[PDB]
């Protein structure tokens, strides 16, 4: 994280503007997580099937 | 580790397991995102 003492000079725009940035920085890492997991569940799901 | 001669039991017990994994994951990037947040709230707040 950044340090307070820095930010604390800037605008409240400019700040604001920080935190809208890290929202679908977030989103797309969990997205990412999500799609890491469907390729695991892969092959045990085509065991399953195999009888 | 091939898993055709697993049981069906074992099978589905295996992928139980990974729900609790990956909510993990997801957990440890909601925490770190938190973390980045704070002093820029803090920040705000400060005005």
Same mark, same amino acid.
Request: negative net charge; proline residues 4%.
């Given at each position: 994280? +950044? ?13 604001? &503007? @920080?935190?809208?940035? !890290? *929202?679908? +920085? ?13 390729? &695991? @569940?892969?092959?045990? !799901? *085509? ?5």
């Amino acid at each position: 994280s +950044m340090d307070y003492e820095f930010l604390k000079s800037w605008t409240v725009e400019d700040l604001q &503007k @920080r935190l809208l940035a !890290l *929202d679908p +920085m977030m989103e797309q890492e969990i997205e990412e997580i999500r799609q890491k997991y469907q390729s &695991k @569940r892969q092959p045990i !799901l *085509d065991a399953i099937e195999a009888k």
